Amino acid sequence: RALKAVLVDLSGTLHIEDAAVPGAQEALKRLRGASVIIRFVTNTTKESKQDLLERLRKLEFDISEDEIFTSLTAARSLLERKQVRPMLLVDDRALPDFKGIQTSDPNAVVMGLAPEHFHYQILNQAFRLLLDGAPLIAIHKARYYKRKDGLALGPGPFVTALEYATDTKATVVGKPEKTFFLEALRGTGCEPEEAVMIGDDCRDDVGGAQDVGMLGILVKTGKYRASDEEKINPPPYLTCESFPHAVDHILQHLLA
């Protein structure tokens, strides 16, 4: 084998957050010199690709839109391939990522985190579409997330609500699903066994990736807490102190 692609988590790994991880920018420059394929990945249901992109550029990361693959991109890919018309239960700010997807006579349900749509009447309409055989596509299933005033419900509980109602599993597109990481390499010409994933979240980043054949590097910044390394078996391929260190390891060890 040989290493041809690198998947880099964004939040926790490159920036943490609205401030860059120290060395991150120069480390990414080192990476681009290595002549390796690079894809920046993340779970989001509310930030468009341009939104993330604008933020990364303000932190002086030089990145293309073609290199960013998020759970929204993944949700959009699935829609094009299945040729379906979604009922879009998503934040308005995610809509630019479904530009061009037809919504008339919906025959699919896409769920992200969308408080304005998460109420009885609209959930029951989604339910009634599911009964009719429409698939349920979950951008991801996080239970909760941390906002200014405490933890708040993520999309995961609402998705789980509809699975329970219909007694069926959603198709989950984001991390840690296997299909996420495989979709991330579509168009790269690269197989997962020729790829490494770098992130701060052991289950969602390393666990998920290692499960498709990728090498997983846990970095100890951002969301990482002490001993997170042993929350998976097998353990991570490598546990580094930060993205820069991960990059240094890739250059001196894996790149042939």
- Please state the three-class secondary structure of 81-144 as a single string: HHCCCEEEECCHHHHHHHCCCCCCCCCEEEECCCCCCCCHHHHHHHHHHHHCCCCEEECCCCCE
Q: Is 43 annotated as a binding residue?
A: yes
Residue 28 CB, nearest distance to Na ion (Å)?
16
Q: In the complex with Na ion, which residue's Cβ is closer, 74 or 87?
A: 74
**In sequence order, what E strands does the chain have?**
5-9, 37-42, 68-70, 86-89, 108-111, 136-138, 144-147, 150-153, 171-172, 195-199, 215-219, 238-240
Q: In the complex with Na ion, which residue's Cβ is closer, 191 or 229?
A: 229
Q: In the complex with Na ion, which residue's Cβ is closer, 48 or 221?
A: 221
Query: Which run of H or E residues covers position 163?
Result: helix 156-166
Residue ranges in contact with Na ion by CB under 5 A? 9, 11-12, 199-201
CB distance 249 to 240 below 8 Å = yes
Residue 127 CB, nearest distance to Na ion (Å)?
32
Residue 119 CB, nearest distance to Na ion (Å)?
30
Residue 163 CB, nearest distance to Na ion (Å)?
25
* DSSP-derived secondary structure letter, 174: S
Residue 222 CB, nearest distance to Na ion (Å)?
6
Distance CA 244, CA 242 (A): 5
Distance CA 249, CA 11 (A): 21
Residue bearing tokens 């990145």: 63
Q: Is 9 annotated as a binding residue?
A: yes
Q: In the complex with Na ion, which residue's Cβ is closer, 11 or 239?
A: 11
Residue 97 CB, nearest distance to Na ion (Å)?
19
Q: In the complex with Na ion, which residue's Cβ is closer, 201 or 228?
A: 201
Instruction: Say which amino acid occupies 70.
Output: T
Q: Is 42 annotated as a binding residue?
A: yes
**Quick one: which of 102, 10, 31, 56 has its CA closest to 249?**
31
Q: In the complex with Na ion, which residue's Cβ is closer, 126 or 218?
A: 218
**Quick one: which of 3, 17, 7, 74 has its CA closest to 41?**
7
Q: Is 45 annotated as a binding residue?
A: no
Task: Tell me which residue has its CB nearest to Na ion.
Answer: 12
Q: Is 200 annotated as a binding residue?
A: yes
Q: Is 132 annotated as a binding residue?
A: no
Binding-site residues for Mg(2+), please? 9, 11, 200
Binding-site residues for substrate, please? 9-11, 42-43, 175
Binding-site residues, please? 9-11, 42-43, 175, 200
